[PDB]
Every structure is written in C-alpha cells, then in structure tokens.
Design a protein around this ligand. Structure first.
Ligand SMILES: C[N+](C)(C)[C@@H](Cc1cnc[nH]1)C(=O)O
Ligand SMILES: [Ca+2]
Ligand SMILES: [Cl-]
Ligand SMILES: [Cl-]
Ligand SMILES: [Mg+2]
Ligand SMILES: [Zn+2]
Length: 431
C-alpha cells in the first residue's frame, strides 16, 4: 500500500455511476476537446463526454503552464480525480502528472468506450451545435474527398481569414485553401459588415455560394499592441468574425476549424505555400441578408438596454471596461456602454484568453456557460454581444451559438460606433 506514480487504481463502471453527483469527485476527459464537444472521433455511436466531466486534453501535458490550467479549472488535490479517454492507456501520463503534483486520489476509468458510449443508460453530454466547430481531421477528410461525418454537401471551400496581411496566408496555409482579407466583408469606415450588394459581390468573387460549405480558420501570430495593425496577427478571431458575417449573409453551412491554423499543424498535416487563385462563382444564390436577426444595430441595441428580456454583453478587456484604455490606436474615447453586462474577454483587444484554451481552441463550454450564468447571461434572453468593432463579440456570439442558444446576436457597431456619437452616454472608472 504505497502511492505509486506509475500504477493507477481502476474505478469500475458501477462505482463511477454512483459518483456522478458527488461534489468532491472530478471526472476528467483526456481526449481532444473536439471529441469532448461531441465529435465521434473513433466511430462511436454516442459522442460527447460523461455527464459532469471536465475537459483536459492529454495534448496539454507539454504545456509548461499545465498545473496552472488544472488549478484555474478548480481541480483541487482534495478532489477525487477520475480520468478517462478512449483507452485507459491514454490516461497513463495524465495520472502520473497529477500524482507528481500532490494529487493523491487519482483513478482511471477503463470502460468509457465502448461500454459507457455503447449504452444509453449511461448519461452523456455534448455541445449542441458541435458540428459547426470542426476538428483538423474533419477538414483533412473534406479536402481529401473522403467520407466524413456531419457533412452531406457536394461543394466546399476552405477560407484562410486575415486582416490586411496576405503573409499570414502565404507563409503557410491548409492545402487548397484561398485567403479572404476581413476588409472584403467589413467596411473600414464603420468597421461594420458591408451592404448586401457588396457582400454578394465579395462572396461571389471568392467563390462562395449560399449552398457552399465554408470552412473558416485563421492564424494566430502573437499580436503586439505596439504594432500599427495588431489585428493582422489575430487571424482566428477574424475567421470567426467572417463566420458571423457569412452566416448573417446567408451561407447555410459555415464551419470554424477549432483552434485555427495551430490545430492543423498540431495534427501533423501537410502545409502549402501556393498562392491559390480564386475560382469565382456567378450567383450567390440567396437574398442577402438571409439571417438578419444575427446582426443588431445601435437603435435596436439602445432598445435592448431598456428591455427586460434583452441585454447587451460587453466582450472587452478590463482596462477597456473601466476606461483605462480605449483598446485601439484608432479610437480616442475611453469608456463603456451604460447598462451592458460585462463579460471580460482577455488581456487586450487582440486576445481572447477567457474564451480560449492555450492552443486557441474554444474554452470548455460548461465553464463559459457557468461564468455567463453568474452575470445573468442566459439563453432565455435576446443577447447582443459586442466589443470594439465586433470581432471579439462575434467570437463570444459563436460560442453561444454552438450551445444552441436561440436568440443571440452581435451588436456590430460596438464601442467604436457608440463613442463616435458625442451625444451617446457612457460610463468610466471602476463601477
Ligand atoms: C476591425 N479591425 C480589423 C480594424 C479591428 C479588428 C479587431 C481585432 N480585435 C478587436 N477588433 C482591428 O484590427 O483593430
Ligand atoms: Ca462597454
Ligand atoms: Cl487569433
Ligand atoms: Cl491568418
Ligand atoms: Mg462593427
Ligand atoms: Zn462531480
């Protein structure tokens, strides 16, 4: 009877089943976050995670901040740790890592697949709209013309988003993908989405129809706030921003590669540097916009500030919220929109640490949901997410859309449009 760093106690299916409601038990899913979200990566009939389990991919074991990730997830040494993956062998290194850091109650569950997944009496959970947040393997099967799940279309295009930075695409991209500058879909004068006529033309010239499956991704290139255009390095936020605009426009099937470009290279897939020419299409094929409810403008936003069933959600950094900084080198006014619910997004305007993991995949949606619920950000409301110009608000909106929330929007204008009118009220300082 000795603590063994390399020999781990097995917990049975019946034992784990009896502990699903225990507050001191932490069930840890070491598979990829995509599988955790619901993707049936091994052909399992039921995808997702054990109900109540948290996400901690074994891939993160190479992260030097691994222990900080665990502690911020509130996984404490006094908790009973139960690990599972597709196989118990995949949990071995994670079990050792917990034990090496003072966690003495660590077990491995061996029968998640196919025992737990293969019986509908064992409760499981999943991200409702998980098929919109695709893993790298799914994209690779798509461009390879192989049979892939959650895909029934015959037309697709992979789009590499960037903000006035073609080098982000030319330095390395997914094979066959074409680049889309974010200026194709949004105006530099308002930093709002372009008019329906411009969107129709831009989408056609990039080879996108309403019936085309669009797979969007961006490349994170460490934005530096001191640069003139730090947005040129926050490629994946722009990709989700373009996903918002295309879904608003009328593209029926829009996918986002979870984690952006880094997920493609972390999977070990081949990289291309070809400047792929566009293959234009003559007609977009649907009225624009087909989903106008996704976009909220300033008159509706002011109305939502006065409504009981509606709220605006400020997806900005804390220094922006208290008026310490504007967040952008092209915005002079500092402050916040009065009456909006604050949802701290990250360190500055070009990072989304509170909505992402270190590998830029979306944060465990249960954590996003519970943090939102503490501030009254709940699905029974009409919510309009916003930030400075709508990039970060789009990413927060997309996270809510993935949860199946029925009435989420983006207030496009954001702090940029709000503060450009000197007659609009604003608050400042610590609340
Ligand atoms: C609308 N542009 C592309 C000018 C913004 C986009 C943006 C990035 N993070 C928040 N907003 C920028 O880069 O400042
Ligand atoms: Ca604000
Ligand atoms: Cl990014
Ligand atoms: Cl990019
Ligand atoms: Mg805008
Ligand atoms: Zn529990």
């Amino acid at each position: 009877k000795h603590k063994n760093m390399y020999d781990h106690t097995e917990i049975t299916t019946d034992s784990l089943l009896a502990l699903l409601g225990s507050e001191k038990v932490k069930i840890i899913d070491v598979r990829s976050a995509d599988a955790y979200n619901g993707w049936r990566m091994r052909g399992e009939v039921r995808g997702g995670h054990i109900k109540g389990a948290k996400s901690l991919p074994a891939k993160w074991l190479t992260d030097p901040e691994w222990l900080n990730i665990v502690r911020f997830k509130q996984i404490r040494p006094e908790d009973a740790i139960v690990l599972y993956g597709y196989t118990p062998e995949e949990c071995e290194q994670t079990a050792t890592r917990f034990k090496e850091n003072g966690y003495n109650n660590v077990s491995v569950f061996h029968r998640f697949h196919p025992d737990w997944t293969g019986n509908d009496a064992f409760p499981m959970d999943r991200l409702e709209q998980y098929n919109r947040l695709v893993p790298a393997e799914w994209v690779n099967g798509l461009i390879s013309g192989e049979e892939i799940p959650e895909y029934d279309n015959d037309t697709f295009i992979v789009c590499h988003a960037h903000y006035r930075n073609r080098d982000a695409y030319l330095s390395g991209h997914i094979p066959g993908a074409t680049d889309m500058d974010t200026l194709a879909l949004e105006s530099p004068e308002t930093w709002n989405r372009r008019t329906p006529e411009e969107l129709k033309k831009a989408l056609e010239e990039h080879g996108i129809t309403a019936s085309t499956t669009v797979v969007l991704y961006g490349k994170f290139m460490h934005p530096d706030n001191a640069d003139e255009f730090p947005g040129s390095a926050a490629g994946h936020i722009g990709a989700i921003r373009l996903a918002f605009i295309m879904m608003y426009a009328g593209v029926e099937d829009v996918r986002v590669l979870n984690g952006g470009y880094q997920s493609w290279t972390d999977a070990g897939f081949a990289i291309s540097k070809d400047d792929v020419p566009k293959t234009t299409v003559p007609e977009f094929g649907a009225p624009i916009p087909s989903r106008p409810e996704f976009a909220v403008d300033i008159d509706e936003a002011k109305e939502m500030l006065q409504s009981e069933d509606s709220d605006l959600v400020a997806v900005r950094s804390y220094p922006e919220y208290i008026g310490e900084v504007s967040g952008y080198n092209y915005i002079k006014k500092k402050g916040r929109i009065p009456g909006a619910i604050f949802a701290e997004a990250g360190s500055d305007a070009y990072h989304m640490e509170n909505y992402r993991n270190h590998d830029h995949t979306t944060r465990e949606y249960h954590e996003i949901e519970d943090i939102w619920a503490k501030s009254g950000i709940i699905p029974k409301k009409h919510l309009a997410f916003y930030c400075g110009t709508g990039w970060r608000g789009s990413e927060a909106w997309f996270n809510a859309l993935l949860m199946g929330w029925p009435r989420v929007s983006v207030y496009d204008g954001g702090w940029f449009e709000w503060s450009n009118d000197p007659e609009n009220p604003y608050e400042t300082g610590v609340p």
